[PDB]
């Protein structure tokens, strides 16, 4: 839950990031725990994608340690391109470890099943975050995207060490403290994916934040379901490789896993193509 | 008006990049030619701040031929913040080589004395340009600000190799292929000194961006004073060095000033201190 190791040259298909604990590599989709202090409700957020980046970067489920690696599709390296006054990603990007959107689950309020992914995490403080940083963030408040029949829901958070942290509690607040940036993730969602020939993103609760009491529901939610896929309990695991090497009693626990991890790689970061400093309007 | 000669580390106090031209350092403020093409009107722009970035990178105008250093506050690096929904500056941001906003002379439009640097010019293109480049751009529209109470003058340009330039001949076309850039524009430049303690800045004819012929006008204002600074026939100089490498018929003429520049000493990027990162509301 410590530090990082980097496989290969940033922006390469090479690329892979791993959270190391002491020195030793984890899963970063199972070994770090949801709750820094659960009675709190202080949850550990594993970051993939710092603020005004563009590279599309996600935990792997189908490799063992689930490191971080950059998006493809049919052999490309994703990028969610400029789509103006945007720049990038308008968040530190990232999901809560220990969850997971059971797809043969669904949402009522939310018609919709889950998306087979871990929670997707927003967090809006100030810093700027690393790929693989593990932070610590309350949850302030959740919204609904709609992807074609499954609810992706993102947590809004904040970092517990950010100087404006203890003004903030409820999702009102980042109405109060951040005027704009929760329409601005409306607008972000919506069409970050029109330049890539997809079309506009549809939200539930027509764009409506609900509440900090609301998401903490929907994450307590996607842990038991992550606790019962941990456990080889789950109906359907397809891809996922479970492999973690701190739970003792798991299925699919397995410590030389962590051993199997090549050092950490010397390579500078490759260049990335001026294509994507464009600003879509 | 072709190559770069940066001396240590960007980020860095002392971090300076120098013209050159045949691997020799020019004057940046004097020795590059305003027109690259004067028939057609094609400029050589001094790009002194890609978009996207935050350090106040200024071609320095009491050096000897006026490298590109970082604005310093009481002695500390200055950088621009911040302020949602942007990113440092939305523009690549830079000058016109050998022109005036004369500041010993109220302007009529403005009713203001001139700010004693350069004309500034935001070039809209899609790639994000580097400190140091001449680059050749043409006029598109220019906005009247008066920043801190000072005439300064912004010109609307497209590097004559953007995809998007030969669609791009007015301040109409800017409207058309960059909707709600030149209101972005105008709002910027009014708030980026808010989280500095500074004042709202004020744009005359109500921000509205004046038209090619109109930014035209204006350029050759300020060349014109330029020109008369150069000969030394300015009634306030301000303390400007006037040294150059390529005007033979000006007082302060001398090819082997460019002799006495230090070798390029290009180090690493230094650090940016993690508060730059913060979004202003
Ligand atoms: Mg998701
Ligand atoms: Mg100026």
Chains 1, 2 share one sequence.
């Not at 609904?144 to 517990?160: C, Q, S």
Request: aromatic content about 10%; hydrophobic content about 35%.
């Amino acid at each position: 839950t410590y530090t990082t190791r980097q496989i290969g040259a940033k922006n390469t298909l090479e690329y892979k990031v791993y959270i190391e604990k002491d020195g030793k590599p984890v899963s970063a989709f199972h070994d770090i725990p949801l709750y820094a202090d659960k009675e709190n409700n202080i949850f550990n957020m594993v970051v993939e994608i710092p603020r005004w980046t563009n590279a599309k970067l996600e935990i792997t489920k189908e490799e063992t340690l689930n490191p971080i690696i950059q998006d493809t599709k049919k052999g490309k390296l994703r990028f969610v391109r400029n789509c103006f006054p945007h720049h990038g990603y308008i968040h530190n990007y990232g999901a809560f470890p220990q969850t997971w959107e059971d797809p043969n689950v669904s949402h009522p309020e939310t018609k919709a099943v889950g998306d087979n992914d871990p929670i997707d995490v927003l967090e809006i403080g100030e810093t700027i975050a690393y790929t693989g940083q593990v932070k610590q963030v309350k949850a302030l408040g959740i919204m609904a995207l709609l992807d074609e029949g499954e609810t992706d829901w993102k947590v809004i958070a904040i970092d517990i060490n950010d100087p404006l942290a203890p003004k903030l509690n409820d999702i009102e607040d980042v109405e109060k403290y951040f005027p704009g940036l929760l329409r601005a993730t409306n607008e972000w969602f919506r069409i970050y994916k029109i330049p890539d020939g997809k079309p506009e993103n549809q939200f539930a609760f027509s764009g409506e934040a609900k509440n900090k009491k609301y998401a903490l529901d929907i994450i307590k939610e996607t842990h038991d379901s992550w606790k019962q896929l941990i456990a080889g309990k789950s109906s359907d695991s397809k891809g996922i490789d479970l492999t973690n090497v701190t739970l003792p009693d798991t299925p699919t626990y397995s410590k030389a896993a962590s051993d199997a991890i090549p050092p950490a790689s010397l390579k500078a970061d490759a260049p990335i193509d001026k294509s994507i400093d464009k600003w879509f309007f």
